[PDB]
Structure formats: C-alpha cells, structure tokens
Amino acid sequence: NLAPLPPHVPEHLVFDFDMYNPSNLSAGVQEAWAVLQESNVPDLVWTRCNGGHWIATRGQLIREAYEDYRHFSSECPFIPREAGEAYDFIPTSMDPPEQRQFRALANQVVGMPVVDKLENRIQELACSLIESLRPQGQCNFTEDYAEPFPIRIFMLLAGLPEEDIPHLKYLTDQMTRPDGSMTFAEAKEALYDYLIPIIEQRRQKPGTDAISIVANGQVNGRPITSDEAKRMCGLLLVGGLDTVVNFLSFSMEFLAKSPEHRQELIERPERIPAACEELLRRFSLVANGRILTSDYEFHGVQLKKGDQILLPQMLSGLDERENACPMHVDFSRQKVSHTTFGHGSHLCLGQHLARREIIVTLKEWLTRIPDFSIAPGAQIQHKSGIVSGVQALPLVWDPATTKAV
Ligand code: HEM
Numbered sequence: 324n325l326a327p328l329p330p331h332v333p334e335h336l337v338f339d340f341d342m343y344n345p346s347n348l349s350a351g352v353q354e355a356w357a358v359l360q361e362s363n364v365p366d367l368v369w370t371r372c373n374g375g376h377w378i379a380t381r382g383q384l385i386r387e388a389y390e391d392y393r394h395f396s397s398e399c400p401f402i403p404r405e406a407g408e409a410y411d412f413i414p415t416s417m418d419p420p421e422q423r424q425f426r427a428l429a430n431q432v433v434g435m436p437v438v439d440k441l442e443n444r445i446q447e448l449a450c451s452l453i454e455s456l457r458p459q460g461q462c463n464f465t466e467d468y469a470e471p472f473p474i475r476i477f478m479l480l481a482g483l484p485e486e487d488i489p490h491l492k493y494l495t496d497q498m499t500r501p502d503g504s505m506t507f508a509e510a511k512e513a514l515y516d517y518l519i520p521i522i523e524q525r526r527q528k529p530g531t532d533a534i535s536i537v538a539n540g541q542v543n544g545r546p547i548t549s550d551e552a553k554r555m556c557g558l559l560l561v562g563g564l565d566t567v568v569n570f571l572s573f574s575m576e577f578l579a580k581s582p583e584h585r586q587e588l589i590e591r592p593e594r595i596p597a598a599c600e601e602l603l604r605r606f607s608l609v610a611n612g613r614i615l616t617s618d619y620e621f622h623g624v625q626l627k628k629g630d631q632i633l634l635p636q637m638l639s640g641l642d643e644r645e646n647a648c649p650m651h652v653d654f655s656r657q658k659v660s661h662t663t664f665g666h667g668s669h670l671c672l673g674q675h676l677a678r679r680e681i682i683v684t685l686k687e688w689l690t691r692i693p694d695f696s697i698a699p700g701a702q703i704q705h706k707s708g709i710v711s712g713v714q715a716l717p718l719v720w721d722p723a724t725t726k727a728v
C-alpha cells in the first residue's frame with residue numbers, strides 16, 4: 324500500500340496519510356484530516372499512500388498553490404495519478420488561459436440567475452420532503468433528505484429522469500469515494516456513455532434544460548463542440564450529485580448533537596446565512612489537487628515536475644492559523660476564513676445553488692422539527708475521499724414537539 328519513496332523526497336517529510344481511509348476516521352473525517360495540522364507535522368509532507376504525493380497542510384500554502392496555476396496545474400487534479408490522468412472535465416481539468424471561456428457557459432446553467440428560476444421549486448421540495456418525514460419521529464437522513472433534495476433539484480435542472488438517480492449516483496461516487504469495483508476511468512466512461520446519446524438528442528432538438536443549454540452553447544463567441552459539452556456536463560452531474568448531498572449530512576449531524584446551536588437559529592433566524600458560512604468552514608469536505616509543471620522549490624521543499632500535490636480545500640478553514648478554536652462552531656465568528664468552495668481561478672460555480680440549498684434546509688427543517696437527536700446507541704461513521712461524507716445518519720424525535728406548517 325506504500326509506493327517506493329522517490330529519490331528527491333527526504334525521509335523527515337514522510338507522513339503516510341491515506342486520503343481514502345485516514346487512520347483517525349472514527350473521530351470524524353475533519354478530525355482525521357486535522358491530524359495533518361498537529362504541531363510536529365511540517366507545512367508540506369509526502370505520503371507514500373495512493374501512489375505517492377505531496378500534501379500541503381496549512382491554509383497559507385493551500386491558497387498560494389491554488390493561486391499559482393503556472394507551477395500547480397489542474398491538468399491532473401485528482402489523486403491517484405490514474406484518476407488525475409483520466410480526469411478531463413471542463414473547466415476543472417484546464418488552466419488559464421483556456422479555462423476561463425468555459426466558466427461563463429457553466430454560469431448560465433448553475434449560476435445565480437438560474438438559482439432564481441429555481442427558487443420556488445427548491446423551497447417547495449424541501450418543505451414537502453420534511454413534512455413527509457415530520458410525523459414519523461425518525462429518518463435515515465442521508466437517504467431520506469440529503470440525497471433526494473439536492474439530487475432531485477439537479478435532475479430537474481438537467482432535464483433528466485429521477486429513475487436514473489441510482490445509476491448516476493453510483494457512478495459519481497466511484498469518482499470521489501471508489502468502492503474498488505471501478506477505476507476512475509471506467510466510471511467516467513460509463514458517465515459519458517450515459518451522456519453521449521442525450522447530448523446528441525439535445526443538439527438536434529434543444530430544450531431549456533441545463534444539458535441543452537451547455538450542448539448548444541457558445542464559448543467566447545464560437546460553438547461548443549459535442550465533446551467539450553460532454554466534458555462539462557459530466558462535471559455538472561458530479562457537482563449536482565456529490566457535494567451538497569454530503570455537506571447537508573455533516574451539518575444535520577452537528578445540529579442533532581448540539582441543541583444550543585439549534586436554539587440559536589430558531590430564536591435568531593436572521594443568523595441562518597452566517598451559520599451556513601460557519602458550517603461550510605467547520606464541515607468543509609473537498610480535497611483535490613494539482614500537478615507540478617516544472618521542478619520548483621516551494622517553502623524550502625524541492626518539488627519535481629510531474630509530482631502530484633494534494634491541496635485540501637477542507638484544511639484551510641480548520642487551520643488555527645486562519646481561525647482560532649477552529650473545531651469550535653461559532654455562528655457569530657467575525658472573520659470566517661475558508662476555501663470550502665476552492666480558491667484561485669477555479670472557484671466553485673455551484674456555490675450560490677449550494678448556499679441556497681443549505682439555507683433553505685436549515686430554515687425549513689428547524690421550522691418543523693426543532694428538537695431531534697441521533698438515534699439511540701448510534702455511532703455516526705464518516706467516509707473520506709475527494710469529497711468526504713457521512714455513511715448513515717439515523718435521527719429521532721418526538722412528533723409532539725414538531726410543527727406542521
Ligand atoms: C457544498 C457544496 C460544494 C462544494 C464544497 C464545492 C466545492 C468546489 C471546489 C473546491 C471547486 C474547485 C475545484 C478545483 O479547484 O479543482 C469547485 C468547482 C466547481 N464546482 Fe463546486 N462545490 C459545491 C457544489 C457545487 C454544485 C452543486 C455544483 C453544480 C451543480 C458545482 C459545480 C462546480 C463547477 C462547475 C466547478 C468548476 C469551476 C472551474 O473549474 O472553473 N459545485 N467546487
């Protein structure tokens with residue numbers, strides 16, 4: 324499980340962290356990654372896991388490297404190397420300058436003006452899902468809400484049938500948290516197999532859905548190619564199916580465990596947007612990276628062309644050098660420093676949709692089910708990867724303490 328140490332890597336920088344199965348996982352996935360920020364651990368380490376790669380452990384370095392696309396390229400942005408090599412989504416597998424023209428098209432389908440066309444439907448689905456669960460006095464939150472709420476909104480946006488969710492969700496998860504049955508390349512190709520006939524159909528007969536808009540789009544005034552459209556749509560599916568889905572479960576687990584924070588938002592609902600931001604910091608969940616374009620000395624460490632570096636978006640906001648008492652959730656925190664939605668030229672385009680889904684969930688859940696807890700005797704298990712998540716989140720409550728709107 325440990326790749327031979329490259330000749331240029333010194334032993335004193337070796338820390339064999341496994342991003343797909345970190346040793347301290349039972350403590351919580353954020354806690355497990357935060358072992359990289361213990362006082363004896365250097366700012367930049369090499370792990371022999373997952374083929375061997377660097378890890379920047381501190382916000383300062385993570386931010387610097389995300390800004391410097393000349394040295395730290397997105398051409399191979401996933402670990403392990405085979406995944407990064409196969410990864411060809413647009414815009415994420417591109418560096419500036421070529422990357423930038425594709426962002427505007429992606430903005431047309433997932434950006435703020437769209438969140439606006441979707442506002443009422445987002446609100447309606449959250450309320451309907453929560454009301455359906457409310458009288459039961461229990462739910463399996465991952466399957467009962469965290470998945471169907473954002474995924475059904477995405478499938479609506481993309482004009483895709485809801486009965487396709489199990490297949491698409493399985494494939495997406497193999498790209499971020501592989502079970503071992505499929506390589507990244509096999510999962511990606513299966514996703515493209517799905518998207519190919521649909522992109523063709525919607526270039527022939529355009530609708531108003533996101534796939535039609537991307538497939539018939541222009542990038543800096545020239546037509547998108549069918550294959551650029553495919554590479555963008557694949558990314559949109561992964562964002563739709565495996566980001567907010569996981570984040571909602573970290574947030575709801577925290578609220579189930581912290582009646583004081585629930586009460587704060589019930590009594591002071593105007594604090595919900597700020598709470599969303601603080602939860603985005605504390606339960607940050609993404610970690611991808613970059614590949615070195617040249618030999619480069621970075622913070623006193625010799626990096627070689629072709630070396631991969633994991634730059635965990637998750638870690639910046641958990642760094643005590645960015646936020647004091649970083650594991651503490653404080654909704655009144657004055658400067659909430661984080662890179663949860665990335666940093667540099669690839670800043671998340673889905674972040675407005677994500678925040679709306681989070682804020683609607685917090686408001687509409689606490690309106691109906693203010694008082695809830697983790698199920699008796701349950702120990703909540705997390706899972707780690709490119710995007711981390713919660714395996715299961717059984718919640719209970721007394722229906723007498725709930726409110727039908
Ligand atoms: C909590 C929710 C989310 C988080 C934490 C998140 C995180 C991120 C991060 C860290 C990146 C930068 C990756 C890099 O630099 O290589 C990114 C980019 C992106 N995200 Fe999000 N994302 C979320 C939700 C979404 C959603 C819901 C969508 C769409 C449905 C989406 C679409 C995109 C797109 C298209 C990019 C590519 C931007 C580019 O490469 O220029 N994201 N996201």
Ligand SMILES: CC1(C)[C@@H]2CC[C@@]1(C)C(=O)C2
Binds near residue numbers: 412415611
């Ligand atoms: C790293 C991401 C969260 C960002 C959007 C989905 C994701 C898995 C990507 O491939 C880019």
Ligand SMILES: [K+]
Binds near residue numbers: 400407
């Ligand atoms: K690649």
